[PDB]
Amino acid sequence: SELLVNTKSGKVMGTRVPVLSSHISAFLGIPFAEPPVGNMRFRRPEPKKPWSGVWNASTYPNNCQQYVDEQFPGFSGSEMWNPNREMSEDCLYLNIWVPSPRPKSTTVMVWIYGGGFYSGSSTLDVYNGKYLAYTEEVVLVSLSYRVGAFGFLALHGSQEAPGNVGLLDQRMALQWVHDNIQFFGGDPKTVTIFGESAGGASVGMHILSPGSRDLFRRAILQSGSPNCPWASVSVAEGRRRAVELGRNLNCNLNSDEELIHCLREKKPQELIDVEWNVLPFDSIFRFSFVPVIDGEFFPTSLESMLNSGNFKKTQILLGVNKDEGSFFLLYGAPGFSKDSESKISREDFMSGVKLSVPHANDLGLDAVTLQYTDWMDDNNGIKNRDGLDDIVGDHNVICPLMHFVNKYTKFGNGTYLYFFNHRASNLVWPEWMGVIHGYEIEFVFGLPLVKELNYTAEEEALSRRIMHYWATFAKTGNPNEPHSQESKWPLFTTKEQKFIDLNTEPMKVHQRLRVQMCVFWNQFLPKLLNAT
Amino acid sequence: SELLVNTKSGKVMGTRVPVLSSHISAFLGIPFAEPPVGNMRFRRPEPKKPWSGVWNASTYPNNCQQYVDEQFPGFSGSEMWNPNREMSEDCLYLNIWVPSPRPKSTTVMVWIYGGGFYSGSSTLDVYNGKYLAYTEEVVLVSLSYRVGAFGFLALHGSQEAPGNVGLLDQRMALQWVHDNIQFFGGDPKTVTIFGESAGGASVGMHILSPGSRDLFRRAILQSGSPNCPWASVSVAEGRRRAVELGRNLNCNLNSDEELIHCLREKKPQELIDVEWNVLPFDSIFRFSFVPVIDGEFFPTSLESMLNSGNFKKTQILLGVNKDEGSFFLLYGAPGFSKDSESKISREDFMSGVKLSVPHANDLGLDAVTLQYTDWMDDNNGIKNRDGLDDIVGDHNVICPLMHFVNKYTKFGNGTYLYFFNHRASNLVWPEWMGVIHGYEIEFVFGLPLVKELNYTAEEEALSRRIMHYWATFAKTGNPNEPHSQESKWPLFTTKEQKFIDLNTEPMKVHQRLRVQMCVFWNQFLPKLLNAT
């Protein structure tokens, strides 16, 4: 049967699903690890023990335990990111969408969801891989991994809670794909891992980590890179936060043994209820439990690795959205509201700057403020709001990605850069937020092809182009069709640094994406903070 | 006789001079101080002893001893600034242009020449006051003062060479005007002192100094302010430079007494030949012997004085030229040449930055470079050349003047600001230098009214407007005619900060002259250098 597959872990039974008036096979909720529960909480994952009989893979699995956004109850804009399944620590599963008839050896794409390492689900409607699998004829896989304290609590030196276990979950899933995707018609030697935000950072982390490199062929990074200021912490800061977490739950802190034991006795929601209390600074775009530079998963500092070419050399495709910062300002900066234009005063502007660059001394804050202020019109509410939006996006997403791309490109085999600036016609978020963090995802997964979702004809066209770029890149290492007559997406080189815009207008090639600001965030500010 | 005047110092005989087909009286070379020679070198000036008989004031006096620019022998562009009379330490004289018939009590204007405190002459063709005196019907006076070591060698604590004696020369001349201008038809209660560059800084210094304030009514500052980074030094740096000067001439350095005695035995040219060797840094727009914050002429620091309103409160008219820095780059920065377009490489750009801000540490140099670099086109030779031109002008002239104007305006009785951006059609300097430091002077003194000098009709018109603005301001404290139909030069206020352009086009009012850069030079950079 087309829905029956015998893998190395056992047999699996999928289900037939309708898609754009046709059908494809879906294998949902396939386990790739032993349930990380009880004494296994915080530990590295262990391979799923093979099973007898047939595993029923017709329904989505549970979502990993996580903080749930209740800022706007009932609002689709925010609830579309919340878990849509029961939460459980027993959540290490993967999903596979296979074309019909089942291929023999076709290109594979593995999606790694984002969510700031503190949230995320492989089961969201926006991640439904059936459209992409069907349209581009690829085997689409979406994995899952532990988030929050569950996946990143880090007490370096201890083997009970070493940290980075969430990244190891991802790796274990990639290992399963490498070992079993051939039975689903996928080519294990042609897998492209791709992800957004924390997922994009994760992809970059696997490119860097010696232990992950051999498990995939190519990579795509959307709005995220390994070197993002929020993507990782030192073992010292990791340790400090783990201890403070224990302190919030009145745990014995005399030893790692007692802290870890005390934390493993807590219900999941108990850890989640105090998760945010361990941040060192009053900040925005900063998350509690994230990857840690441990000297194991990451041999040395990310910067030294990028400088010496200590990473997988292959082709990469990556980019960012025009307004990455608006989401974080709406949720935590004074002056911003979902239902107002959020025109910002000078007061709130400087308050926002302090929140956006928490690690900066006064001189640093002044440098940022000057860099983003138009002194011929400093009380312009719209300029202050947009200036703040740019600061958050440049510092947290764009400039770090540009640093990565430039460092990677010196040793890589091919780079393709994009700048997504189309605001969906059916967005429910206010206009001031612009092209929001994460909203290019729906175009990548082809939601605009479904009439009932209410996108325009140009947005369907844009979605098909993007899906085809992504899949052709996954297949060949070049998003462009060899003999196409269509406009060509140029290769990003150290010299020209070309990139293209991604919207419904005719392709436009540019150069040096936000260089002016990035030189500020990547060269000057760091120098200033280190000297003062 | 119209050419005979009996002053408190004695009688003077002037001469009749032709001007634009008419005539006026001229009293040239009137002594206002005892010749500061011999044991008087470096000392404060003493009043000129009254004389019997008639002083022949029909010819220009000698020019004070000074360094002479020989960079372009024969070239009018540079030689028009060199002394046009015999040089001599016996040079403290003043000149007066009086309308005919002689007025009874008319507005007086006293010109104070610039020249970086190391050069300058009251006798240059561009300072011929006959045009302004004649056209606007004002009594025009031009004074002189000691420059270089002769006027600013400073060994604080010593009374033999206290410093600031060049400023005291100016003051003594202003004292003579106050005491005697009534005999020439001038109103001693309506005198406006005005000057360019070091002369403008001087004007600002008299506004600040308690001992000078009562000697004039209003002031005009052209391309210069008291707080300019090159206009003054501490008593410590002054002392240090005086000692190094002595060291260049192999003087006994055991005591001030011996140093001063050794210096007074040197011929003038001996001091001038080594004057430039005492600068602390490899620099541009920095001069050896300048005014010193002595606690006497200047009660406290200039900044504390400006902050507490410790200065003469009256009306002021001031402004700058579009390209103040080009002159200094041509003469001392790598890559610039008089006969080439001077397109600058990245190499020479950063070399120029180091030369322009000598006091800056590496972080400071980086801050400047980033502030003036277009990273989307960093190898653009024209952008680098112009960027450097802007740096020199903003740091040395414009931003310091904007700081002064904003601080002064809080306590003053009326401010009028201008931005001179017309490049004379007959300029001999290359095009890349633009609207050069000092080239608004010829329009202020009305040279464009003389056909033989080859200016256009619009430049004659511009000159008349400017002369009329200057003279009407001198007379009333407002450059505008009460019931004129002409376009009005708005008052600069703390709130609106309005200013006008000065060119051959219809008047255009603007606001916040180069605020973006000035906030960098007046608030940020100083904070950076103090913290690091």
Swiss-Prot record, chains A, B:
GO terms for molecular function: acetylcholinesterase activity. The gene is ache. PROSITE patterns: CARBOXYLESTERASE_B_1, CARBOXYLESTERASE_B_2. Inhibited by substrate concentrations above 0.5 mM. An interchain disulfide bond is present in what becomes position 593 of the T isoform. Glycans are attached at N56, N413, N454, N530. Belongs to the type-B carboxylesterase/lipase family. Found in the synapses and to a lower extent in extrajunctional areas of muscle and nerve, and on erythrocyte membranes. This is Acetylcholinesterase. Changing E196 to Q/D: Decrease in activity. It is an enzyme of class 3 (hydrolase). It holds the Pfam family COesterase. Keywords: Cell membrane, Disulfide bond, Glycoprotein, GPI-anchor, Hydrolase, Lipoprotein, Membrane, Neurotransmitter degradation, Serine esterase, Signal, Synapse. Changing H422Q: Almost no loss of activity. Isoform H form is a homodimer; the asymmetric form is a disulfide-bonded oligomer composed of a collagenic subunit (Q) and a variable number of T catalytic subunits.
